Design a protein around this ligand. Sequence first.
Ligand SMILES: [C]C1=C([C])[C]=C2C(=[C]1)N=[C@]1([C]([C][C]=O)C3=[C][C]=C(Br)[C]=[C]3)C(=O)[N]C(=O)N=C1N2[C][C]([O])[C]([O])[C]([O])[C]OP([O])(=O)OP([O])(=O)O[C][C]1O[C](N2[C]=NC3=C2N=[C]N=C3[N])[C]([O])[C]1[O]
Ligand SMILES: [Zn+2]
Ligand SMILES: [Zn+2]
Ligand SMILES: [Zn+2]
Length: 751
Amino acid sequence: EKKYRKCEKAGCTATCPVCFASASERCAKNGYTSRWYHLSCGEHFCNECFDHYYRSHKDGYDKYTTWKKIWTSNGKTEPSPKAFMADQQLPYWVQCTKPECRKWRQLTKEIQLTPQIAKTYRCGMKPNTETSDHCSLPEDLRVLEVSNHWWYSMLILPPLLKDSVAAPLLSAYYPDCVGMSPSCTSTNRHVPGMNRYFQPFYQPNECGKALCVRPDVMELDELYEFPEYSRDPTMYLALRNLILALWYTNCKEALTPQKCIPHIIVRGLVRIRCVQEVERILYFMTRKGLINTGVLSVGADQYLLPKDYHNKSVIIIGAGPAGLAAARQLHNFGIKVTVLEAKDRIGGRVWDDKSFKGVTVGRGAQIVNGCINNPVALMCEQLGISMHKFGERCDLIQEGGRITDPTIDKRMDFHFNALLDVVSEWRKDKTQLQDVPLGEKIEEIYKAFIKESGIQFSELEGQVLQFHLSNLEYACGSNLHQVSARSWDHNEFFAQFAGDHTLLTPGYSVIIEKLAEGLDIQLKSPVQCIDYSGDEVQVTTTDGTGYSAQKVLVTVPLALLQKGAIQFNPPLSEKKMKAINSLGAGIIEKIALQFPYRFWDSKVQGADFFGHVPPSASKRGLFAVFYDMDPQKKHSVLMSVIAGEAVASVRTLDDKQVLQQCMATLRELFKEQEVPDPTKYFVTRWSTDPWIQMAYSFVKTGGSGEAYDIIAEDIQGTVFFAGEATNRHFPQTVTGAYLSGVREASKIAAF
Ligand SMILES: [C]C1=C([C])[C]=C2C(=[C]1)N=[C@]1([C]([C][C]=O)C3=[C][C]=C(Br)[C]=[C]3)C(=O)[N]C(=O)N=C1N2[C][C]([O])[C]([O])[C]([O])[C]OP([O])(=O)OP([O])(=O)O[C][C]1O[C](N2[C]=NC3=C2N=[C]N=C3[N])[C]([O])[C]1[O]
Ligand SMILES: [Zn+2]
Ligand SMILES: [Zn+2]
Ligand SMILES: [Zn+2]
């Protein structure tokens, strides 16, 4: 036969291929062979070692055949001698852990790389074990080759990771389809101790779950950033999935390259490319706020992004969830941030009262709707605090004291949802200019249904239907006659947060205060003018104090944008003003009442809340739901909500008059017994708080969900916008406001 000195592959850069396997007694070593098999520009094996495993009469055949059976039953990747070599025989490479050295070294071929070796390796030391004379030695010349893109081009098979920390979460997938080795026995074997709200990965063919990622498909922004993985995403996916698994395994500390590296176990020079790449992917996912986020804090020179991204200054207007999320992100990235807040406190529509004995009572937000993958649940895990999952039970108690039979509750809910289904059908072919108020469409459909069907409802059934109507006015923050029939539920077209609905028992203020800790926050500093006509943005407060930065982030409430309280120079565009004015500034108010004892326990029997059947439509929304504010059933605090048309009715009532109406309502709801006087209470006035004037946004008649995106659009890469009224997928909530701030910090840090 004819022998060859050179590699089989045209264009391979190895002038002298050497065999890494040396498995056969006739291994060609560094000389001639019938074929030099190419794995990479730095790695080859001779035909004698190929046959050692491949041919049925050679000594390596039993090992190759046993591997082969495991490979083909567990994965979708073809078996071959090359795949076998890369998975089983190619030597490992590891970095010196001396911080001033970090040189790559090849381990001898029988040394199995472990995390422990990757954490403790030093040049010249026996693995798993002097001076530092061996650190000075040059790296093998093949190491530098790996950093070029053409090296990856010439790598014939994608790497497959071993014992990935992501593997227990990915058992429904073929391992090689997510970049993991099919021969790995721990890969192919709820991560215990991981928070059950952390479900980072979609199961196969799954959708409809907010913030899950497909472990087997790259997203578009990943492809824009890493287009070299468009053809074969295997290697990128394994590193991204590993990073997510590690972050959600320990979300209380910054995830760094050095923490990831011992968990990257794969043979060959390609491990060098994997380690170089994991660092780039880490910075990308950090900037996007997918890891290293929440209430994580850093010190100086422990910034989360390298000093490149640091070269900016930012003024943030408003210190609510959105403003503080952006400030925490940007500060952690190493960017200079100043927060200007109009009020004498931080938090915005997060404002907790800590003066009720034994409980924390939000004047503003206190519920989390859907905890799975929710950043609020992440931050609770980081802070070690607990939430209370709501029970389903909610008796509808009538004035006079009767409890509504639950079959009436369900029946009238059935009828109410049927009306919304007709609206859903009616709108399928309607343009924005053909929009109709939801409340008007509902009332029309209902009257037509009574006429057509002839059905006769009791007075109680009609009042219970009014209750279900009031729940939707509560969710929208408005009487439905101002809400768009086309677009009221626009956001439900996107994946929503799954899982538990909870009461944030310790209060969102705990999270707000931790986000803000250590930041440069200026209270009682209402911004009056933002001028971005110069080289730097000029921000002036109402007392004439001037601030300047390269970029500015506006997070003020939608109602304050509608009233134009900040003057912009140049002015906001006509298109931006139309979007701003197409959304509604929804409103609810709250009352909280402390009592000497839990007078409701005998009748309510531990339920988290009870409903209040409205006696007339004129009273829809007036204290419709009462919340028991102690899930441990020890303290006696109720909270109730004023929603819909009821908000206008309490506008000209002072607090004592509201309290009096609420106590008259409670004594009607508990007419058969005595109700004690309250000993402490508050009544909120969000609608007249000058710097807020609302509770949460909704889409007004004629508007579109697209308005949320338009408000979110930056101006000139210089003026950015966040807040709950800028989050199209997740409007209204603390969660969506938080995510909007993280989003804007990502935009700002990219420049
Ligand atoms: C009452 C209430 C309120 C008010 C709110 C809320 C609530 C309540 N809650 C809630 C809701 C949602 C919806 O859905 C609900 C309801 C019911 C149920 Br059953 C469920 C739920 C809850 O609970 N949760 C949540 O999540 N949320 C809520 N809410 C709402 C919230 O709160 C919101 O969203 C947030 O907060 C937002 O955030 P932002 O966006 O950030 O905002 P604020 O907070 O407002 O902040 C802002 C700021 O800014 C300032 N400013 C203005 N202007 C100005 C300023 N500064 C400066 N300068 C100027 N010029 C103000 O002050 C504030 O702070
Ligand atoms: Zn050989
Ligand atoms: Zn080659
Ligand atoms: Zn070294």
